[PDB]
Design a binder for this molecule. Structure first.
Ligand code: CLA
Ligand code: CLA
Ligand code: CLA
Ligand code: CLA
Ligand code: CLA
Ligand code: CLA
Ligand code: CLA
Ligand code: CLA
Ligand code: CLA
Lengths: 149, 73
C-alpha cells in the first residue's frame, strides 16, 4: 500500500497474544515484579496511558497513541449509537415530532421497581419517562429524521 | 431514597426504647412503661420524698423543656 507515497510501516512488530492480559503491570518494569504494597495497585492505574514512562522509543509511543485514538473513536461511536438506539426504541421522538409545543422530550424508561418507577413522569401523549435535556430530538428534527427505524 | 420515590412508608423508624425507658424511670408516663418512678406501686415512688410531686408534675406536663419526648429521629 505505497502508491508512491511517503508511507512506511512495519509488517509485524507486535505479536497478538492474551498472556500479557494476565500480568497486570506489564508496561511498567517497577510493577512487573508483582505487588508488595497497596501503592502498586494505584500506580498501575496512574501510568496506564503514561506511554513515555513505559518506553523511550518515540515510534512505539506514536503507535500506541494511534491505536489508542482508534479505540477512543470506537468508544465514542458506541456511545453515539447507544444514544441513537435509545432514541429509536426507547423514546417518544415521533409523538413529539407530531406535536412539539405540547409534549416534553422523553427517553430512557425506568424499570418499575423498589419505587423507582416514579421517575417515569408523564411527558405528553401518554408517554411516561425521564425528560432528557441533551436536545437530541431537536438535532434529529434538524437532520430530518421522520421514522424511528 | 424511600421518601423520595413517593413511598415514605418504608422508612426504617426504630423507637428510642432505652432512653424512653430511662425517662419513665424518672416518672414519665407518656410511653406507658410503669417502671420505677412511673409506677405508683413501686417502692422508689412511695418513699415520702418532698421532691416527688413537683418533679412528676414538671416531667409529665408537656409544656416545658424537661425530658422531651423522643421519636426515631
Ligand atoms: C443507572 C443510572 C443511569 C443510566 C446508566 C443512565 C443512562 C443515560 N442517560 Mg440518564 N438519568 C439518570 C440515571 C441514569 N441514566 C438519573 C438519576 C437522572 C435524573 C432523573 C437522569 C436524567 C437524564 C437526562 C436529562 C438525560 C439522561 C441521558 C442518558 C443517556 C446519556 C449517556 C450518558 O450519560 O453517558 C454516560 C456519562 C458518564 C459521565 C459516564 C459515567 C461514568 C460511569 C458511571 C463509570 C462506569 C463506566 C465504565 C467504567 C465503562 C468502562 C470504560 C471502558 C469501556 C473504556 C444515557 C444512555 C440523556 C439522554 O439523552 O438520554 C438518552 C439526557 O438528556 N439522563
Ligand atoms: C483530493 C486529492 C488528494 C491528494 C492530491 C492527496 C495527497 C496525498 N495524500 Mg491523500 N487522501 C485523499 C485525497 C488526496 N490526497 C482522500 C480523499 C483521503 C481519504 C481516504 C486520503 C487519505 C490519505 C491517507 C491515509 C494518506 C494519504 C497520503 C497522501 C500523500 C501521499 C501521496 C499518495 O497517497 O499517493 C498519491 C495520491 C494520489 C494520486 C491522489 C499525498 C501528498 C499518505 C501520506 O500521508 O503519506 C505519508 C497517507 O498515508 N491520503
Ligand atoms: C482481542 C484483540 C487483541 C489482543 C489479543 C491484543 C493483545 C495485546 N495487546 Mg492490543 N490492541 C487491540 C487488540 C488486541 N490486543 C486493539 C483493538 C487496539 C486498539 C485500541 C490495541 C492496541 C494496543 C496497544 C497500544 C497496546 C496493545 C498491547 C497488547 C499486549 C498487552 C496488553 C496488556 O497490557 O494487557 C491488556 C489490557 C487490556 C485488555 C485493557 C482492557 C481495558 C480497555 C482498554 C478498555 C476498553 C476500551 C477498548 C479498547 C475499546 C472499547 C471496547 C468496546 C467493547 C466498547 C497484548 C499481547 C500493549 C503492548 O504492546 O504491550 C507492550 C500496548 O501498548 N494493543
Ligand atoms: C476510551 C478509553 C480507553 C481506551 C481507548 C484505552 C486504550 C488502551 N488501554 Mg486503557 N484504561 C482505560 C480506558 C481506555 N483505555 C480506563 C478507564 C482504565 C482504568 C483507569 C484503563 C486502564 C488500562 C490498563 C491497566 C491498561 C490499559 C491498556 C490499554 C491498551 C491495551 C489495548 C489492548 O491490549 O487490547 C484491546 C481491548 C479491546 C479491543 C477490548 C477489550 C474490552 C475489555 C476486555 C472489556 C489500549 C490502547 C493496557 C496497556 O496496553 O498498557 C499500556 C493496560 O495494561 N488500560
Ligand atoms: C473531543 C471530545 C473528547 C475528548 C477531548 C476526550 C478526551 C478524553 N477522554 Mg473521552 N469521550 C468522548 C469525547 C472526548 N473525550 C465522548 C463523546 C464519550 C462518550 C460519552 C467519551 C467517553 C470516554 C470514556 C468512557 C473515557 C474517555 C476517556 C478520555 C481520556 C483518555 C485517557 C487519557 O487521556 O488519560 C487520562 C485522562 C485524565 C485523567 C483526565 C481526566 C478527565 C476528566 C475527568 C474529564 C476530561 C474532559 C473530557 C473531554 C470528557 C471525557 C468524558 C469521560 C471521562 C466520561 C481523554 C482526556 C477515558 C478516561 O477518562 O481516561 C481514564 C475514559 O475512560 N472518554
Ligand atoms: C452508550 C452507552 C449506553 C448506556 C449508558 C446505556 C444505558 C442503559 N440502557 Mg442501553 N443500549 C446501548 C448503550 C447504552 N445504554 C446500545 C449500544 C444498545 C444497542 C445494543 C442499547 C440497547 C438497550 C436495550 C435493548 C436496553 C437498554 C437498556 C438500558 C438501561 C438498563 C441497562 C441494563 O440494565 O441492562 C442489563 C445489565 C446487565 C446485563 C449488567 C440503561 C440506563 C434497557 C432499558 O432501557 O430498559 C427499558 C434495555 O432494555 N439499552
Ligand atoms: C437499592 C436501590 C436501587 C436499586 C435496587 C436499583 C436498581 C436498578 N436501577 Mg435504580 N435508582 C435508585 C436506586 C436503586 N436502583 C435511586 C436512588 C435512583 C435515583 C437517583 C435511581 C434511578 C434510576 C434510573 C434513572 C435508572 C435506574 C436503573 C436501575 C437498573 C440499573 C440498570 C443499569 O444501569 O445497569 C447498567 C447499564 C449498562 C449500560 C451496562 C450494560 C437496576 C436494576 C436504570 C433502569 O431502570 O434501567 C432501565 C435507569 O435508567 N435507577
Ligand atoms: C457500637 C454501636 C452502638 C453505639 C455506640 C450506640 C450508641 C447509643 N445508642 Mg444504640 N443500638 C445499637 C448499637 C449502638 N448504639 C444496636 C445494634 C441496636 C439495636 C438495633 C441499638 C439500639 C438502641 C436503642 C433502642 C437505643 C439506643 C440508644 C443509644 C444511645 C444511648 C446508649 C444506649 O442506649 O445504650 C447503648 C447500646 C447498647 C449497649 C447495645 C449495643 C452495643 C453493641 C447511644 C449514643 C438509645 C437512644 O436513642 O439514645 C437517646 C435508645 O433508646 N440504641
Ligand atoms: C454530645 C451530645 C449528647 C450526648 C453525648 C448525649 C447523651 C445522652 N443523652 Mg442526649 N440530647 C442531646 C445531645 C446529647 N445527648 C441533644 C442535642 C438533645 C436535644 C435537646 C438531647 C436530648 C435527649 C433526651 C430527651 C434524652 C437524652 C438522653 C441521653 C442519654 C441516653 C441514655 C440511654 O438511653 O442509654 C441507655 C441506658 C442503659 C442503662 C442501657 C445519653 C447519656 C436520655 C436521658 O436523659 O438519659 C439519661 C433522654 O431522655 N438526650
Amino acid at each position: 500500500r505505497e502508491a508512491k507515497a511517503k508511507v512506511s510501516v512495519d509488517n509485524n512488530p507486535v505479536p497478538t497474544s492474551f498472556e500479557k492480559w494476565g500480568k497486570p503491570g506489564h508496561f511498567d518494569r517497577t510493577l512487573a515484579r508483582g505487588p508488595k504494597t497497596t501503592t502498586w495497585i494505584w500506580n498501575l492505574h496512574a501510568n496506564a496511558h503514561d506511554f513515555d514512562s513505559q518506553t523511550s522509543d518515540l515510534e512505539d509511543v506514536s503507535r500506541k497513541i494511534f491505536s489508542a485514538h482508534f479505540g477512543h473513536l470506537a468508544v465514542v461511536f458506541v456511545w453515539l449509537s447507544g444514544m441513537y438506539f435509545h432514541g429509536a426504541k426507547f423514546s417518544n421522538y415521533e409523538g413529539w415530532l407530531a406535536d412539539p409545543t405540547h409534549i416534553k422530550p422523553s427517553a430512557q424508561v425506568v424499570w418499575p421497581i423498589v419505587g423507582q418507577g416514579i421517575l417515569n413522569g408523564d411527558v405528553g401523549g401518554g408517554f411516561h419517562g425521564i425528560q432528557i435535556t441533551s436536545g437530541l430530538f431537536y438535532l434529529w428534527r434538524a437532520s430530518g429524521f421522520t421514522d424511528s427505524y | 431514597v424511600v421518601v423520595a420515590f413517593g413511598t415514605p412508608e418504608k422508612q426504617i423508624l426504630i423507637e428510642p426504647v432505652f432512653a424512653q425507658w430511662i425517662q419513665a424511670t424518672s416518672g414519665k408516663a407518656l410511653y406507658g412503661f410503669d417502671v420505677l418512678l412511673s409506677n405508683p406501686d413501686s417502692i422508689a415512688s412511695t418513699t415520702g420524698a418532698a421532691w416527688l410531686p413537683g418533679w412528676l408534675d414538671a416531667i409529665n406536663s408537656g409544656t416545658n423543656s424537661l425530658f422531651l419526648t423522643i421519636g426515631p429521629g
